[PDB]
Design an enzyme around this catalytic site. Structure first.
Site, PDB file in Angstrom:
ATOM      1  N   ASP A  19      50.682  29.580  89.709  1.00 49.28           N
ATOM      2  CA  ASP A  19      51.226  30.111  88.150  1.00 49.28           C
ATOM      3  C   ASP A  19      51.929  31.559  88.906  1.00 49.28           C
ATOM      4  O   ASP A  19      51.691  32.470  89.273  1.00 49.28           O
ATOM      5  CB  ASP A  19      49.935  31.008  87.871  1.00 49.28           C
ATOM      6  CG  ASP A  19      50.241  31.736  86.636  1.00 49.28           C
ATOM      7  OD1 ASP A  19      51.438  31.823  86.068  1.00 49.28           O
ATOM      8  OD2 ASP A  19      49.179  32.420  86.168  1.00 49.28           O
ATOM      9  N   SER A  75      68.668  35.315  80.757  1.00 51.60           N
ATOM     10  CA  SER A  75      69.591  34.101  80.459  1.00 51.60           C
ATOM     11  C   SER A  75      70.661  34.438  79.585  1.00 51.60           C
ATOM     12  O   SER A  75      70.789  35.270  78.975  1.00 51.60           O
ATOM     13  CB  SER A  75      68.590  33.109  79.674  1.00 51.60           C
ATOM     14  OG  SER A  75      69.175  32.106  78.975  1.00 51.60           O
TER      15      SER A  75
END
Length: 330
Positions: A35, A199
């Site tokens: 994770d 992004s």
């Protein structure tokens, strides 16, 4: 040193991925959920409340000659999906894919929430976010990657998750045969303890690319892709019959649909998530309403590039002094 381990979806929907991990001496192999959105290595154990164990493999420290109680240390964690666990702490030898760390903090669960009990396939979590998020008190502990880092050939690990198929986590090297084209690297902020990046935009299907900054985290422990409501609305508007359902808890769509792809930007590069990756199947057995793999982050407080996004790429988690993230197509 390096390590290389195969990671395998737990079910037919790729809800999560498990990777075998060797703990203790002799080795006890547990299948852990790696994770990159948390920083605790915790396991089902001989100390876990018996009614909260249902099919998991447990770690038994008393059977490990290298286990040592970390005196006074406790841990307690709550995850974004509302699940939680807590217990005490041992140090022991931990190996992943041939890479060995001695003195790793292994957090033994005394209590786990129902979601964990009900998932027989996950024996614990191995956190790969920054150690500043580690919950051990009163002495915070380091992640497996942090402990291994100095010994690694290169201070990196890579996530290569499969779509409906096994993939790979590598430590200490970049497998240049595992991706196509070039890796595009992008800046990371560690201010919140995550692999947080921005992004450069998105496209829906064959549509034009929208240049827009989307700050989010690369999180292998989250199944879906969570993005701003504007982005998600633009995606689902291209699927006839798709709607946001408060009763179901997100966007659903007719199972008869063919889903468009979703592209996200990494600098000037582009990662394409095929439409099929966004199908998470019937909301309930036999239903013709299917659950979407792109959902709104509104009210999460953060955008999350979870498995839906990451499995479309070869992802480099670069833990150099100034961390960065790399993405390649594959």
């Amino acid at each position: 040193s390096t390590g290389s381990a195969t990671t395998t979806p737990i079910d037919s929907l790729d809800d999560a991925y498990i990777t075998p991990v060797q703990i203790g001496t002799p080795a006890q192999t547990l299948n852990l959920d790696f994770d990159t959105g948390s920083s605790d290595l915790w396991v089902f154990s001989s100390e876990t409340t018996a009614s909260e164990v249902d099919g998991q493999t447990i770690y038994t420290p008393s059977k490990s000659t290298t286990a040592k109680l970390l005196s006074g240390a406790t841990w307690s964690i709550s995850y974004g999906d509302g699940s939680s666990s807590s217990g005490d702490v041992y140090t022991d030898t931990v190996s992943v894919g041939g890479l060995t760390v001695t003195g790793q903090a292994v957090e033994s669960a005394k209590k786990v929430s129902s979601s964990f009990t009900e998932d027989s396939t996950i024996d614990g979590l191995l956190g790969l976010a920054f150690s500043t998020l580690n919950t051990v008190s009163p002495t915070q502990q380091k992640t497996f990657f942090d402990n291994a880092k100095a010994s690694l050939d290169s201070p990196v690990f890579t996530a290569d998750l499969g779509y409906h198929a096994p993939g790979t986590y590598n430590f200490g090297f970049i497998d240049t045969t595992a991706y196509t084209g070039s890796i595009t690297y992008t800046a990371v902020s560690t201010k919140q303890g995550f692999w947080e990046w921005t992004s450069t935009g998105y496209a829906v299907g064959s549509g034009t690319f929208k240049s827009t900054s989307i700050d989010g985290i690369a999180d292998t422990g989250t199944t879906l892709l969570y993005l701003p409501a504007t982005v998600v609305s633009a995606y689902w508007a291209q699927v006839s019959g798709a709607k946001s359902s408060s009763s179901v808890g997100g966007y659903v769509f007719p199972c008869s649909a063919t889903l468009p792809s979703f592209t996200f930007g990494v600098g000037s590069a582009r990662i394409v998530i095929p439409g099929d990756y966004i199908d998470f199947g019937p909301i309930s057995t036999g239903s013709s309403s299917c659950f979407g793999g792109i959902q709104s982050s509104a009210g999460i407080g953060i955008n999350i590039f979870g498995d839906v996004a990451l499995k479309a790429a070869f992802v480099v988690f670069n833990g150099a002094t100034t961390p960065t993230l790399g993405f390649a197509s594959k």
